[PDB]
Amino acid sequence: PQITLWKRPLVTIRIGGQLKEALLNTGADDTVIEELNLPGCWKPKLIGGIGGFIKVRQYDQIPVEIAGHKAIGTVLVGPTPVNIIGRNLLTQIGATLNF
Numbered sequence: 319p320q321i322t323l324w325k326r327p328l329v330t331i332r333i334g335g336q337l338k339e340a341l342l343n344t345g346a347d348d349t350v351i352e353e354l355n356l357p358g359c360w361k362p363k364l365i366g367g368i369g370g371f372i373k374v375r376q377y378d379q380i381p382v383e384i385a386g387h388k389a390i391g392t393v394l395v396g397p398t399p400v401n402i403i404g405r406n407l408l409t410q411i412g413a414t415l416n417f
């Protein structure tokens with residue numbers, strides 16, 4: 319699709335068998351999802367943003383479907399204000415910025 323930016327670029331994703339809503343985020347290196355159970359093992363990490371740092375659980379090689387497009391990669395789980403799809407997965411679905 320072509321998505322304009324008058325509204326937040328929110329889309330449906332599937333992760334761990336469950337549907338969620340997430341923000342397509344060119345300003346995020348990584349994909350960060352609200353607290354949930356994910357199958358498999360994780361390792362702790364800290365990530366930063368506009369206000370400081372939070373602690374997350376890093377899961378690797380997680381399948382994520384984003385608006386019907388498949389990705390498999392790193393998903394960070396923790397107390398993010400908004401579910402965000404970052405560049406690590408945006409590149410897998412061939413997403414670009416255009417103007």
Ligand SMILES: CCCC[C@@H](CN[C@@H](CCCC)C(=O)N[C@@H](CCC(N)=O)C(=O)N[C@@H](CCCNC(N)=[NH2+])C(N)=O)NC(=O)[C@@H](NC(=O)[C@@H](NC(C)=O)[C@@H](C)O)[C@@H](C)CC
Nearest residue numbers: 343345346347348349350365366367368398399400402404
């Ligand atoms: C979570 C809230 C929504 C997404 C977030 C993405 N902003 C980028 C900006 C880059 C830093 C300025 C971001 O957080 N990126 C992180 C996302 C986390 C991630 N792991 O990818 C990032 O790339 N972080 C890397 C980059 C390095 C940071 N610096 C450092 N480590 N020293 C990371 N590994 O820490 N947007 C925002 O922070 C904006 N918030 C919003 O638009 C709305 N606020 C809320 C709460 O939704 C609105 C109601 O204000 C700010 C700028 C106000 C306009």
